[PDB]
Amino acid sequence: RNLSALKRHRQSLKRRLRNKAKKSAIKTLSKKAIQLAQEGKAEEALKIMRKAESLIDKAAKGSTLHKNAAARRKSRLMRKVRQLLEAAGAPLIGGG
Amino acid sequence: MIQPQTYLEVADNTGARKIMCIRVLKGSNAKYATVGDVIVASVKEAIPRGAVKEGDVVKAVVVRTKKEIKRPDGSAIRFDDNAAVIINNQLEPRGTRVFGPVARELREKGFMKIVSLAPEVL
Amino acid sequence: MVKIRLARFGSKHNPHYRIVVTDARRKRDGKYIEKIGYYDPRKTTPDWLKVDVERARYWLSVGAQPTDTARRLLRQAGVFRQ
Amino acid sequence: PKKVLTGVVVSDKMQKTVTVLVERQFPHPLYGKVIKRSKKYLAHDPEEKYKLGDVVEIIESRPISKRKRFRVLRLVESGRMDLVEKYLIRRQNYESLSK
RNA sequence: CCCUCGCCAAGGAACUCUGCAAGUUGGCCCCGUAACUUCGGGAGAAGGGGUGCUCCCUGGGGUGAUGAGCCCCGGGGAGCC
RNA sequence: UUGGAGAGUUUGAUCCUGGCUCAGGGUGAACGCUGGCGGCGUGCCUAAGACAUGCAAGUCGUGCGGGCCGCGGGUCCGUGGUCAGCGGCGGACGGGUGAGUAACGCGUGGGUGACCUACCCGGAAGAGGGGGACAACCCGGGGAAACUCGGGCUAAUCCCCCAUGUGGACCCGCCCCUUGGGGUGUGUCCAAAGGGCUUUGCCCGCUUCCGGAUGGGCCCGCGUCCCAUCAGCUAGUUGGUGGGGUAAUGGCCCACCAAGGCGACGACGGGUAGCCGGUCUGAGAGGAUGGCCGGCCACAGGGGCACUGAGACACGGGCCCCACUCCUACGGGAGGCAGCAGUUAGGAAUCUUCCGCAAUGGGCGCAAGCCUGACGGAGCGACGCCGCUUG
RNA sequence: AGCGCCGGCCAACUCCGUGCCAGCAGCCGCGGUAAUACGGAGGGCGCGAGCGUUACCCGGAUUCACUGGGCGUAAAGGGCGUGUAGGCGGCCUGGGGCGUCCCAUGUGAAAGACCACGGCUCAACCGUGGGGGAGCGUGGGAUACGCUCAGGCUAGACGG
RNA sequence: CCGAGGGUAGGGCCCGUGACUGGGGCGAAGUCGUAACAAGGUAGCUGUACCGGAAGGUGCGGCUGGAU
Ligand SMILES: [Mg+2]
Ligand SMILES: [Mg+2]
Ligand SMILES: [Mg+2]
Ligand SMILES: [Mg+2]
Ligand SMILES: [Mg+2]
Ligand SMILES: [Mg+2]
Ligand SMILES: [Mg+2]
Ligand SMILES: [Mg+2]
Ligand SMILES: [Mg+2]
Ligand SMILES: [Mg+2]
Ligand SMILES: [Mg+2]
Ligand SMILES: [Mg+2]
Ligand SMILES: [Mg+2]
Ligand SMILES: [Mg+2]
Ligand SMILES: [Mg+2]
Ligand SMILES: [Mg+2]
Ligand SMILES: [Mg+2]
Ligand SMILES: [Mg+2]
Ligand SMILES: [Mg+2]
Ligand SMILES: [Mg+2]
Ligand SMILES: [Mg+2]
Ligand SMILES: [Mg+2]
Ligand SMILES: [Mg+2]
Ligand SMILES: [Mg+2]
Ligand SMILES: [Mg+2]
Ligand SMILES: [Mg+2]
Ligand SMILES: [Mg+2]
Ligand SMILES: [Mg+2]
Ligand SMILES: [Mg+2]
Ligand SMILES: [Mg+2]
Ligand SMILES: [Mg+2]
Ligand SMILES: [Mg+2]
Ligand SMILES: [Mg+2]
Ligand SMILES: [Mg+2]
Ligand SMILES: [Mg+2]
Ligand SMILES: [Mg+2]
Ligand SMILES: [Mg+2]
Ligand SMILES: [Mg+2]
Ligand SMILES: [Mg+2]
Ligand SMILES: [Mg+2]
Ligand SMILES: [Mg+2]
Ligand SMILES: [Mg+2]
Ligand SMILES: [Mg+2]
Ligand SMILES: [Mg+2]
Ligand SMILES: [Mg+2]
Ligand SMILES: [Mg+2]
Ligand SMILES: [Mg+2]
Ligand SMILES: [Mg+2]
Ligand SMILES: [Mg+2]
Ligand SMILES: [Mg+2]
Ligand SMILES: [Mg+2]
Ligand SMILES: [Mg+2]
Ligand SMILES: [Mg+2]
Ligand SMILES: [Mg+2]
Ligand SMILES: [Mg+2]
Ligand SMILES: [Mg+2]
Ligand SMILES: [Mg+2]
Ligand SMILES: [Mg+2]
Ligand SMILES: [Mg+2]
Ligand SMILES: [Mg+2]
Ligand SMILES: [Mg+2]
Ligand SMILES: [Mg+2]
Ligand SMILES: [Mg+2]
Ligand SMILES: [Mg+2]
Ligand SMILES: [Mg+2]
Ligand SMILES: [Mg+2]
Ligand SMILES: [Mg+2]
Ligand SMILES: [Mg+2]
Ligand SMILES: [Mg+2]
Ligand SMILES: [Mg+2]
Ligand SMILES: [Mg+2]
Ligand SMILES: [Mg+2]
Ligand SMILES: [Mg+2]
Ligand SMILES: [Mg+2]
Ligand SMILES: [Mg+2]
Ligand SMILES: [Mg+2]
Ligand SMILES: [Mg+2]
Ligand SMILES: [Mg+2]
Ligand SMILES: [Mg+2]
Ligand SMILES: [Mg+2]
Ligand SMILES: [Mg+2]
Ligand SMILES: [Mg+2]
Ligand SMILES: [Mg+2]
Ligand SMILES: [Mg+2]
Ligand SMILES: [Mg+2]
Ligand SMILES: [Mg+2]
Ligand SMILES: [Mg+2]
Ligand SMILES: [Mg+2]
Ligand SMILES: [Mg+2]
Ligand SMILES: [Mg+2]
Ligand SMILES: [Mg+2]
Ligand SMILES: [Mg+2]
Ligand SMILES: [Mg+2]
Ligand SMILES: [Mg+2]
Ligand SMILES: [Mg+2]
Ligand SMILES: [Mg+2]
Ligand SMILES: [Mg+2]
Ligand SMILES: [Mg+2]
Ligand SMILES: [Mg+2]
Ligand SMILES: [Mg+2]
Ligand SMILES: [Mg+2]
Ligand SMILES: [Mg+2]
Ligand SMILES: [Mg+2]
Ligand SMILES: [Mg+2]
Ligand SMILES: [Mg+2]
Ligand SMILES: [Mg+2]
Ligand SMILES: [Mg+2]
Ligand SMILES: [Mg+2]
Ligand SMILES: [Mg+2]
Ligand SMILES: [Mg+2]
Ligand SMILES: [Mg+2]
Ligand SMILES: [Mg+2]
Ligand SMILES: [Mg+2]
Ligand SMILES: [Mg+2]
Ligand SMILES: [Mg+2]
Ligand SMILES: [Mg+2]
Ligand SMILES: [Mg+2]
Ligand SMILES: [Mg+2]
Ligand SMILES: [Mg+2]
Ligand SMILES: [Mg+2]
């Protein structure tokens, strides 16, 4: 009727709340920049995409994201903005 | 308001799932049983290898009724089903669990063991 | 981590450890990477300890960590000498 | 080494994928006689360049799909429609083994 | 009180010679469907899901001219009470 | 070339055919009769039925703030424990079991230009600024208890922001190579933590990148039982395009497109079964088997699920549904021995609620050390082999 | 110091009792009034802290026969054709090298097994060393036979 | 959205069980007849068919594993 396993569980929730919070923003700020790119609206898309890049890697600093998950998440974020902006171009500002 | 022919769910783990009242054990000629009354019933549907089988003539006590029962405080209570718990000739439940809520009237009628096994007394 | 360990053999009241490099999490008498010597803590026979020192230096050089008793059996064999 | 096998394209009816029918001979582990056995492989053809009767070589590649674990390597011989006829006749003969 | 008709708590054939009478079920579209069989059937077996309205996208036919318009068969997506 | 024995029984008698039977060896055995000792093995093969009680995983005060108690004085501080709390690391190892699985599960040989790996080792480079919360604690409510919610305070190797970029990542280019391998340039993006002593000095820690090493994931050829009185099977079904997902390939998952995939070389179905090193037999070939030991896999009351994390979809972690059981003050609550002993049930049948961490080994720690039913030993059983006695 | 056994197989025999009873029995079989076969006893044979039994695996079983069997009458030729798949296939030359053979090399964990030596007084148990393969990966080689491809023949086969 | 599972309805496979019923194996000394073994007193066997308390009988065609 006890353990140090109960402490590992109390901690797992402090981290779960923290990991879910970071992923929510990553998906929000990223998708936000992909809609903006489709409109394009390039300075606005790229000004947001960069904060989506920053949040991604800042998550890989710890346990929220593996290095490769972030690098793959970054790869698809940028790749979608390129083609989307190829229609109705003008990439200004710059981020690639 | 249970009478002969009335089907009742079985709110225990005896093995029986549906029983059909064949007698109201409350005098010479009671028309109806409510909660706390004992009936005699045949078992119409059992699950395999439970204590009671289909074809058994058992006693049970009604624990839930769809006809609302009235109380001296001016209130009433009604359940979605008609349900009973199977007993022996000592008011004691023949199973070890009671499923679903039961009426508080059972306590006054001396079906205490059922009241305790029930997950909610309303 | 890789560790340098004594996996007991022999029989009851009859110890005979093997000088073995094995994973830190492998069970004691389980499968090991290499056998680099042996040991007879009672010294009942002339050569109770022997060590392939050239090999024990490799695993020491590549990461493996000894035990507080395996270490004294590689120092007793001069794996650490100058 | 990535296993390399040689077989024949028995069915090209898919997009970017052909069916390569490979045979292999070996002695019976008890009766010593040499016996033939066969196996079909779904092989990748991203250029849809391979047709029925081609005698191709496949190389053990990374999964393209469930069951697709070989890429077609090189054409060795074209037009061996005699082998595909041995295959289809065998399959057609199966309706004769029914109840 | 009778006729014809509507509704009913809890029960649900306990009615009665008999579920008599009356409920239930009920069209269309789709899914699906048993013993047995003379291979047709049994079959609408059973059992289920769907059904209004709005906007948007779209496939074929008839008339016409190949088009518009009128008209007939559909398909997909998103909504509303 | 180290290896090969047969006999009884059909007839009045014979020869042949053929079945039954026997002599041998073996067992996790059991049963009867009998029973002295020692050693080393070994002992729930059935109900993966149900379980009383204890124990089987913790550790760091050299990360941090605290309540207590004891020690030296100035009711303030050092210090020693001590207790819970926050923060580390371990808890994914080790230990059990054989249910399920006829499968890339296992064996064997290979693939990864489709991949991850904490701690360990080696090489490169760095630690500069600022802020914040939550438990402990105080205050309030509820309760039999399990035990909570409320408000407010507070530290840190906890948490964010800025900076620096040795460096790495990503996108678009060119170069080598050739499945996503390696280079480089432009843009963008990401580092941190401090603690101890003897102190212009070490030590344990921290951060980013590379390599090693070990441990894995995934994929493929091949091998793997009985029934054909199971002969046809298939809609995520087979392939394609796009995407989601992951460390990573893939129908693994989703949309749409195409009409495919499989099968007498036995598909599909039904039965049984964890598989191998090996074990037992055998002249060999072969047959039988997979307990002990080692490797791998699978499961942790029956199912589903994810979270935390290098790593689990986690036996002694969490959520939910079911079956069962238990406490209760009757309002409500709890549990998961296929860990080690032990109990009960079933069965022809299968052990001590023992001892110690001294050894080996594991975890944490600067270290003294602490935990360790792993283990090392002791106990019961002619169960087995070996040795010994009753002269 | 006990347990099994003493008709043949199969090692060990007499007396009594019983009288198709009581019983034995792995098989063939024993017992119906002189039983080495039932029961006891004497004696004897085999083992010995064991000895018997039951269950099960392999062997004997060449009784699933690859090694290593059969089918007129013992069990066994399909009632007979035709033909699909499949198995198998004449003589000569060459190209390849799939089978097949050889050499090299990697893998084949530890334990076990086997041989040598040693430690527990021996042994069981245990340590240390030695020696191997098959199978598969790779590199090199051989080409008789089997395979394939190509060319020629006429003895099989088919046609005039 | 998926989703353990719960519910409703309809199939398939297997196991056990059932009044009664079919024949089968076995069982020291039952009852009936005598089919087969000799030319077994009707040569036998045979596929089929029909009949009869029972073996069997008879038809058709076939075999010699039929005697003299
Ligand atoms: Mg959002
Ligand atoms: Mg990371
Ligand atoms: Mg209920
Ligand atoms: Mg119930
Ligand atoms: Mg029952
Ligand atoms: Mg019934
Ligand atoms: Mg009851
Ligand atoms: Mg209650
Ligand atoms: Mg001892
Ligand atoms: Mg491991
Ligand atoms: Mg109405
Ligand atoms: Mg009304
Ligand atoms: Mg009514
Ligand atoms: Mg009603
Ligand atoms: Mg009703
Ligand atoms: Mg009803
Ligand atoms: Mg009626
Ligand atoms: Mg009536
Ligand atoms: Mg009546
Ligand atoms: Mg009438
Ligand atoms: Mg009517
Ligand atoms: Mg109506
Ligand atoms: Mg209607
Ligand atoms: Mg009507
Ligand atoms: Mg039908
Ligand atoms: Mg039916
Ligand atoms: Mg019917
Ligand atoms: Mg009918
Ligand atoms: Mg009918
Ligand atoms: Mg018919
Ligand atoms: Mg018919
Ligand atoms: Mg029909
Ligand atoms: Mg039909
Ligand atoms: Mg009808
Ligand atoms: Mg209908
Ligand atoms: Mg219909
Ligand atoms: Mg309907
Ligand atoms: Mg609809
Ligand atoms: Mg609608
Ligand atoms: Mg309307
Ligand atoms: Mg007209
Ligand atoms: Mg028109
Ligand atoms: Mg509404
Ligand atoms: Mg005889
Ligand atoms: Mg005879
Ligand atoms: Mg005789
Ligand atoms: Mg014989
Ligand atoms: Mg004694
Ligand atoms: Mg067991
Ligand atoms: Mg048990
Ligand atoms: Mg049971
Ligand atoms: Mg303890
Ligand atoms: Mg502490
Ligand atoms: Mg198993
Ligand atoms: Mg088993
Ligand atoms: Mg199966
Ligand atoms: Mg496999
Ligand atoms: Mg494999
Ligand atoms: Mg970790
Ligand atoms: Mg609080
Ligand atoms: Mg920064
Ligand atoms: Mg799939
Ligand atoms: Mg789909
Ligand atoms: Mg389609
Ligand atoms: Mg095949
Ligand atoms: Mg099974
Ligand atoms: Mg099993
Ligand atoms: Mg033999
Ligand atoms: Mg096996
Ligand atoms: Mg076993
Ligand atoms: Mg499970
Ligand atoms: Mg259990
Ligand atoms: Mg389970
Ligand atoms: Mg569970
Ligand atoms: Mg698991
Ligand atoms: Mg755990
Ligand atoms: Mg447990
Ligand atoms: Mg509650
Ligand atoms: Mg609760
Ligand atoms: Mg719970
Ligand atoms: Mg016990
Ligand atoms: Mg018992
Ligand atoms: Mg210790
Ligand atoms: Mg202890
Ligand atoms: Mg004897
Ligand atoms: Mg003998
Ligand atoms: Mg003799
Ligand atoms: Mg026997
Ligand atoms: Mg006499
Ligand atoms: Mg006589
Ligand atoms: Mg006599
Ligand atoms: Mg006898
Ligand atoms: Mg005898
Ligand atoms: Mg005698
Ligand atoms: Mg045998
Ligand atoms: Mg044999
Ligand atoms: Mg036989
Ligand atoms: Mg032969
Ligand atoms: Mg023979
Ligand atoms: Mg014959
Ligand atoms: Mg013939
Ligand atoms: Mg025929
Ligand atoms: Mg042919
Ligand atoms: Mg041929
Ligand atoms: Mg030839
Ligand atoms: Mg070759
Ligand atoms: Mg080897
Ligand atoms: Mg070996
Ligand atoms: Mg040894
Ligand atoms: Mg050895
Ligand atoms: Mg479902
Ligand atoms: Mg369901
Ligand atoms: Mg439920
Ligand atoms: Mg008589
Ligand atoms: Mg006659
Ligand atoms: Mg006669
Ligand atoms: Mg005659
Ligand atoms: Mg006659
Ligand atoms: Mg006749
Ligand atoms: Mg006649």
mmCIF file with all atom_site columns, N, CA and C (backbone and C1' of nucleotides) and ligand atoms in Angstrom, chain F residues 55-58 371-373, ligand 52:
data_model
loop_
_atom_site.group_PDB
_atom_site.id
_atom_site.type_symbol
_atom_site.label_atom_id
_atom_site.label_alt_id
_atom_site.label_comp_id
_atom_site.label_asym_id
_atom_site.label_entity_id
_atom_site.label_seq_id
_atom_site.pdbx_PDB_ins_code
_atom_site.Cartn_x
_atom_site.Cartn_y
_atom_site.Cartn_z
_atom_site.occupancy
_atom_site.B_iso_or_equiv
_atom_site.pdbx_formal_charge
_atom_site.auth_seq_id
_atom_site.auth_comp_id
_atom_site.auth_asym_id
_atom_site.auth_atom_id
_atom_site.pdbx_PDB_model_num
ATOM   1  P  P     . C  F 1 55  ? 6.139  -6.420  4.092  1.00 0.00 ? 55  C  F P     1
ATOM   2  O  "O5'" . C  F 1 55  ? 7.283  -7.154  3.281  1.00 0.00 ? 55  C  F "O5'" 1
ATOM   3  C  "C5'" . C  F 1 55  ? 8.551  -7.384  3.863  1.00 0.00 ? 55  C  F "C5'" 1
ATOM   4  C  "C4'" . C  F 1 55  ? 9.335  -8.338  3.010  1.00 0.00 ? 55  C  F "C4'" 1
ATOM   5  C  "C3'" . C  F 1 55  ? 9.451  -7.955  1.545  1.00 0.00 ? 55  C  F "C3'" 1
ATOM   6  O  "O3'" . C  F 1 55  ? 10.453 -6.993  1.276  1.00 0.00 ? 55  C  F "O3'" 1
ATOM   7  C  "C1'" . C  F 1 55  ? 8.741  -10.182 1.685  1.00 0.00 ? 55  C  F "C1'" 1
ATOM   8  P  P     . A  F 1 56  ? 10.440 -6.189  -0.118 1.00 0.00 ? 56  A  F P     1
ATOM   9  O  "O5'" . A  F 1 56  ? 10.716 -7.301  -1.230 1.00 0.00 ? 56  A  F "O5'" 1
ATOM   10 C  "C5'" . A  F 1 56  ? 12.007 -7.881  -1.382 1.00 0.00 ? 56  A  F "C5'" 1
ATOM   11 C  "C4'" . A  F 1 56  ? 12.098 -8.787  -2.588 1.00 0.00 ? 56  A  F "C4'" 1
ATOM   12 C  "C3'" . A  F 1 56  ? 11.929 -8.121  -3.947 1.00 0.00 ? 56  A  F "C3'" 1
ATOM   13 O  "O3'" . A  F 1 56  ? 13.125 -7.520  -4.417 1.00 0.00 ? 56  A  F "O3'" 1
ATOM   14 C  "C1'" . A  F 1 56  ? 10.553 -10.035 -3.844 1.00 0.00 ? 56  A  F "C1'" 1
ATOM   15 P  P     . A  F 1 57  ? 13.066 -6.214  -5.350 1.00 0.00 ? 57  A  F P     1
ATOM   16 O  "O5'" . A  F 1 57  ? 12.099 -5.221  -4.574 1.00 0.00 ? 57  A  F "O5'" 1
ATOM   17 C  "C5'" . A  F 1 57  ? 12.603 -4.331  -3.584 1.00 0.00 ? 57  A  F "C5'" 1
ATOM   18 C  "C4'" . A  F 1 57  ? 12.642 -2.897  -4.069 1.00 0.00 ? 57  A  F "C4'" 1
ATOM   19 C  "C3'" . A  F 1 57  ? 11.338 -2.345  -4.650 1.00 0.00 ? 57  A  F "C3'" 1
ATOM   20 O  "O3'" . A  F 1 57  ? 11.252 -0.952  -4.347 1.00 0.00 ? 57  A  F "O3'" 1
ATOM   21 C  "C1'" . A  F 1 57  ? 13.044 -2.138  -6.242 1.00 0.00 ? 57  A  F "C1'" 1
ATOM   22 P  P     . G  F 1 58  ? 10.831 -0.434  -2.881 1.00 0.00 ? 58  G  F P     1
ATOM   23 O  "O5'" . G  F 1 58  ? 12.044 0.500   -2.448 1.00 0.00 ? 58  G  F "O5'" 1
ATOM   24 C  "C5'" . G  F 1 58  ? 13.222 -0.054  -1.888 1.00 0.00 ? 58  G  F "C5'" 1
ATOM   25 C  "C4'" . G  F 1 58  ? 14.430 0.190   -2.759 1.00 0.00 ? 58  G  F "C4'" 1
ATOM   26 C  "C3'" . G  F 1 58  ? 15.292 1.387   -2.403 1.00 0.00 ? 58  G  F "C3'" 1
ATOM   27 O  "O3'" . G  F 1 58  ? 16.109 1.173   -1.265 1.00 0.00 ? 58  G  F "O3'" 1
ATOM   28 C  "C1'" . G  F 1 58  ? 14.991 1.317   -4.733 1.00 0.00 ? 58  G  F "C1'" 1
ATOM   29 P  P     . C  F 1 371 ? 19.607 -1.977  3.967  1.00 0.00 ? 371 C  F P     1
ATOM   30 O  "O5'" . C  F 1 371 ? 18.856 -2.342  2.606  1.00 0.00 ? 371 C  F "O5'" 1
ATOM   31 C  "C5'" . C  F 1 371 ? 17.596 -1.756  2.310  1.00 0.00 ? 371 C  F "C5'" 1
ATOM   32 C  "C4'" . C  F 1 371 ? 17.205 -1.916  0.862  1.00 0.00 ? 371 C  F "C4'" 1
ATOM   33 C  "C3'" . C  F 1 371 ? 17.238 -3.325  0.303  1.00 0.00 ? 371 C  F "C3'" 1
ATOM   34 O  "O3'" . C  F 1 371 ? 16.132 -4.110  0.692  1.00 0.00 ? 371 C  F "O3'" 1
ATOM   35 C  "C1'" . C  F 1 371 ? 18.222 -1.843  -1.246 1.00 0.00 ? 371 C  F "C1'" 1
ATOM   36 P  P     . U  F 1 372 ? 16.362 -5.637  1.115  1.00 0.00 ? 372 U  F P     1
ATOM   37 O  "O5'" . U  F 1 372 ? 16.660 -6.374  -0.266 1.00 0.00 ? 372 U  F "O5'" 1
ATOM   38 C  "C5'" . U  F 1 372 ? 15.819 -6.162  -1.384 1.00 0.00 ? 372 U  F "C5'" 1
ATOM   39 C  "C4'" . U  F 1 372 ? 16.466 -6.586  -2.678 1.00 0.00 ? 372 U  F "C4'" 1
ATOM   40 C  "C3'" . U  F 1 372 ? 17.018 -7.994  -2.731 1.00 0.00 ? 372 U  F "C3'" 1
ATOM   41 O  "O3'" . U  F 1 372 ? 16.022 -8.991  -2.794 1.00 0.00 ? 372 U  F "O3'" 1
ATOM   42 C  "C1'" . U  F 1 372 ? 18.521 -6.523  -3.786 1.00 0.00 ? 372 U  F "C1'" 1
ATOM   43 P  P     . G  F 1 373 ? 15.747 -9.872  -1.485 1.00 0.00 ? 373 G  F P     1
ATOM   44 O  "O5'" . G  F 1 373 ? 15.103 -11.214 -2.048 1.00 0.00 ? 373 G  F "O5'" 1
ATOM   45 C  "C5'" . G  F 1 373 ? 15.897 -12.178 -2.731 1.00 0.00 ? 373 G  F "C5'" 1
ATOM   46 C  "C4'" . G  F 1 373 ? 15.112 -13.430 -3.028 1.00 0.00 ? 373 G  F "C4'" 1
ATOM   47 C  "C3'" . G  F 1 373 ? 14.019 -13.281 -4.080 1.00 0.00 ? 373 G  F "C3'" 1
ATOM   48 O  "O3'" . G  F 1 373 ? 13.893 -14.498 -4.803 1.00 0.00 ? 373 G  F "O3'" 1
ATOM   49 C  "C1'" . G  F 1 373 ? 13.053 -13.953 -2.031 1.00 0.00 ? 373 G  F "C1'" 1
HETATM 50 MG MG    . MG I 2 .   ? 13.213 -5.550  2.561  1.00 0.00 ? 52  MG I MG    1
#
